[PDB]
Design a protein around this ligand. Structure first.
Ligand SMILES: Nc1nc2c(ncn2[C@@H]2O[C@H](COP(=O)(O)OP(=O)(O)OP(=O)(O)O)[C@@H](O)[C@H]2O)c(=O)[nH]1
Ligand SMILES: Nc1nc2c(ncn2[C@@H]2O[C@H](COP(=O)(O)OP(=O)(O)OP(=O)(O)O)[C@@H](O)[C@H]2O)c(=O)[nH]1
Ligand SMILES: Nc1nc2c(ncn2[C@@H]2O[C@H](COP(=O)(O)OP(=O)(O)OP(=O)(O)O)[C@@H](O)[C@H]2O)c(=O)[nH]1
Lengths: 249, 249, 249
């Protein structure tokens, strides 16, 4: 009864799930979870068939549901103070709605070795001046700092941190990653490039908000089967156990 | 008097119009018309010299002029309910401002064979989970479902449908299409690629709103000479009659 | 004492600054300064490692701090009138918040010869109709109209103008430029392309607003060392004097 054709259709399904990862027919994903002091979470899905590239601006990274709006000072009173040094006209030093921490989850067939997580202050300008900005500051080379998580045959990567109370407490970030290519024909080789270029905005960055992590895990993480690690360090991810008829090195 | 030089300058003009289509000097366009229950239309022009790629998020697809705003429930009360199953806190089941139907008009020198119209619910996630999402679900392969419309020598394509009252009644969509290339030198060949890459956001998605189709046809469709088909199935498009000094196969 | 190792570490620093321009490790920048009648400035940084491409829509180009909002007419009353000819329902003919003038500053290692500044009215449509629009109208070929400014070994380019009181007084604009490549290996050659494609949105267009030019020069231009030319024609830019041990042609 282990051998039934129905069981093999189930085997097909799960073999399909593991191979679909490496297949050109799947997406790669980076999810950015932002955790606020009110316990709520704002979440951005970045996604593409072959190449994720996105800026999350300040307005993308602050809490836009439990919003900071003293009915007294317009937004520019505060923005000017995080635009230039001592250039503010705000009685508020730090907005409540700025995130406390983040988690980056890279999943699907990412080549984690190509990932970049470049977090900057409000102006997006690395270093002391624009002409001295480096396109890749050392802390943007985050690949080896991700934790590798495994769930059966599934692999994904997590990177967590605090934004803090300095410049990066008013964050902007650029995130990019490539789909792993285990062979030599480039997904942007001249014979392929136009078909992937046509899909450069499949899909544009997309966000949601949730009242707590626990509620998000039930209503979203599990519902969409998004690999995840909770604050108490529990892995929430689908699990496809490896199927193979021969040994693997 | 048929032969006058002035008439030939007119011939030049119309020969220019037909050949400008196939020329690298023209844009390709996809227009997305969204029709609401109040009879108004929101319209997005997607456009590029060689390669259109765009996401129209939920906020792009709902009616943002005749807006849904009960002065009682914040937007997240409703959004949460179309983010996760049964996760809403809204007394409104379906927003008035969600579109009833759509028309996609692909025109200029599109290769309709490369078009993709991928409509999803709010979360933009095809299938049962992100790791099983297909980059091209069967219904995104819409090319053969477009109707081919001809106006003299001009060719364009239309695809209409209803959003309905299920998941896609809270639509997001990814649209991409390539300019037709009737010969072998790719518009993204290494000798060309950088010049077209420089124009990847020429132009970013752009929208308008109009109180009715009839008013839009007068104030916009005709004014900008955008090929179009009205709800009663009348073609509104410029018409350049073919000019040629010899027979065509 | 001219020869001290400390002085040579200073020489290293400034040699680094000049060579970092031509290095792949720097960004190219286009800044768009928009000057309003209230003397305020809205500023967009466009930036990329190798290829800038951006649309600044109408909502990006109008003053969004000193906002136009008669508590009487919704935005569409005015927008409809700049969408189609005589299609408005506004008692206001021209919004206060539309910019008077602009300056484009191209800096870092731009090849100014590849720049395009295509300014259009509200609809973004060049010419008399979409099928006749040219991807490059003559006035978009702006490269030779930029003024070349030098500050020691630093080179940058400025282009100024008025928006006026016609169609382009309701501006949209597409700006693109490539990083100068003084040799033959293309930054989008197949061996390089995927790494730069991954960084196509590093960074997305980013804006600020400032109450006056003078205040912006202190709080932003100088603070970020952004090359600049003030309204009275004073150059504000860092200055690295050329260092070389041999003569230069
Ligand atoms: N290490 C470092 N952090 C900086 C610097 N400038 C600003 N920061 C910010 O400091 C914050 C985190 O640094 P920590 O040393 O952990 O201190 P913190 O918890 O943020 O609180 P502070 O003591 O106010 O900085 C981040 O927001 C950084 O961006 C800097 O020059 N060096
Ligand atoms: N065919 C199909 N449609 C679905 C499914 N899930 C949601 N829908 C939605 O159903 C809507 C259109 O389906 P129809 O069969 O025409 O029904 P409808 O007019 O939308 O009204 P309903 O009966 O409430 O679905 C779209 O919004 C679809 O996205 C599904 O599993 N299959
Ligand atoms: N030259 C020219 N400008 C046009 C045309 N249509 C609209 N304009 C606009 O005219 C404005 C600048 O032209 P100017 O000749 O300097 O006149 P102006 O200062 O704008 O004031 P007006 O006399 O109302 O046009 C810009 O906003 C142009 O876009 C046109 O067909 N030719």
């Amino acid at each position: 009864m282990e051998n039934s054709a129905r069981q093999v259709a189930q085997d097909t399904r799960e073999l399909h799930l593991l191979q679909h990862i490496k297949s050109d027919q799947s997406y790669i994903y980076v999810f950015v979870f932002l955790y606020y002091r009110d316990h709520s979470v704002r979440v951005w899905k970045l996604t593409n068939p072959v190449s994720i590239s996105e800026t999350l601006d300040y307005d993308d990274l602050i809490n836009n549901v439990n919003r900071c709006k003293s009915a007294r000072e317009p937004a520019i009173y505060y923005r000017e103070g995080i635009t230039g040094n001592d250039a503010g006209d705000s009685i508020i030093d730090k907005a409540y709605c700025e995130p406390v921490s983040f988690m980056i989850v890279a999943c699907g067939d990412v080549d984690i070795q190509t990932i970049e997580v470049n977090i900057q202050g409000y102006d997006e300008i690395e270093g002391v001046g624009i002409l001295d900005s480096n396109v890749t500051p050392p802390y943007a080379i985050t690949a080896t700092k991700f934790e590798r998580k495994t769930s059966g045959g599934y692999i994904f990567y997590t990177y967590c941190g605090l934004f803090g109370h300095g410049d990066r407490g008013h964050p902007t970030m650029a995130v990019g990653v490539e789909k792993k290519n285990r062979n030599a024909f480039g997904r942007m080789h001249p014979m392929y490039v136009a078909a992937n270029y046509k899909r450069r905005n499949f899909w544009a960055k997309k966000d949601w908000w949730f009242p707590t992590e626990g509620q998000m895990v039930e209503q979203f993480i599990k519902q969409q089967s998004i690999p995840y690690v909770t604050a108490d360090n529990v892995m929430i991810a689908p699990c496809v156990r490896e199927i193979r008829h021969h040994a693997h090195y």
